[PDB]
Every structure is written in C-alpha cells, then in structure tokens.
Symmetry: C2
Subunit: 69 residues, 2 copies
Amino acid sequence: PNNLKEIEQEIEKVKNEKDAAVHAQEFENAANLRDKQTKLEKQYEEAKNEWKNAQNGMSTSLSEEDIAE
Amino acid sequence: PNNLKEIEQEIEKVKNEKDAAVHAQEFENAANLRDKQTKLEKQYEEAKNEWKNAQNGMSTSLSEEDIAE
C-alpha cells in the first residue's frame, strides 16, 4: 500500500552511499548512514507488521463482481 | 634501524580490525581508525623516501678484506 517501496528505496540508496564511501574512506558519515539505515529497517519492519496484521484482520471473500469482471 | 619494523606493524593491525568493525556495526571507534590509518600511510611513504635519498648517492664498492672470506 505504497508504504514499503519508499523505505526499501531509501535503504537501498543508503547502502549504495555507504558502499561508495567505503572505497573513499569516509567513516565520519558512515556511522550516521548506518544509524539511518537501522532506523529505516526498524520502521520497515513495523510497517510490514502492522500491514500484515491489518490484512489478516479482514477476510477476502469472493463476490460475484470478481467473476463478472 | 627499528624504523619501519614498527610503523608497518601498526598499519597491519589497523586495517584488519577496521574491516571487522564494519560488519559488527561498531563505527564509534572505526572513525578514529580511518584517520589513524591514513596518517600512518603518509608517514610510511615519507620515511621510505628519505631513506633512499640519503643512500642512493653513495656507492658501495668492493673491498679486498672480504674477498678472501
């Protein structure tokens, strides 16, 4: 529901930036990048947990409209 | 004469310990390690250059006292 794609992209770009900075020997910002990545991972886990709980709370019954479509 | 015997040893331990801290999510001390490693690399080049500059000028000719050895 347009909630995990953004966090996944942010984690990917943070990882790419950290990998680029590793070759350039930049550890003063590497700690900040790692902390941001960990926070984004925690937020992604929380969002996934709440989304799966909400999905499991409801029942996806099949109606005649699906067959008609 | 006990010049690069210890400088190179310091570089060796910093590099290996640096990589382990990356996977251990320990960048609090890794930031200081990168600065120390960069400084040691500069010192190694300076020490090597001054050693060869003061020795390449002189020539080491043969001596008759060691021919009979």
